[PDB]
Amino acid sequence: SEDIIVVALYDYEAIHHEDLSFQKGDQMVVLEESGEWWKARSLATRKEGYIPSNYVARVDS
């Protein structure tokens, strides 16, 4: 029973309305699945926005 939580493997700063700045070793949950831009919620701040999946890793935690 996996889930849609990913981890940011590199630092990234937001740049839009529902954007999200994560870090090189951050953890975020995904709210929906899409192309390379996934919408997730950063648990470190309970916020949520976009995150380039090309520099992230999907996991069930």
Domains and CATH numbers, the chain: 1-61 (2.30.30.40)
State how far the alpha carbon of 10 is from the alpha carbons of 1, 44, 57, in Å. Answer: 27, 15, 10
Instruction: Return all residues near 34 (Cβ < 8 A) that are at least 6 apart.
Output: none
> Rounded to whole angstroms, how far apart are CA atoms 11 and 16?
16
8 A C-beta contact, residue 32 and residue 40: no
Report angle CA 21, 23, 29 to the nearest 5 degrees: 70
Distance from the Cα of residue 46 to its chain's centroid:
12
Please check whether residue 50 is in contact with residue 42, taking contact to mean a CB–CB distance below 8 angstroms.
no
Which of these, 44, 55, 43, 52, lies nearest to 15 by C-alpha position? 52
Taking the alpha carbons at both ends of the chain, their separation in whole angstroms is: 11
Do 5 and 27 touch, CB atoms closer than 8 A?
yes
With H, G, I as helix, E, B as strand and everything else as coil, classify residue 54.
helix
Q: How was this structure determined?
A: NMR
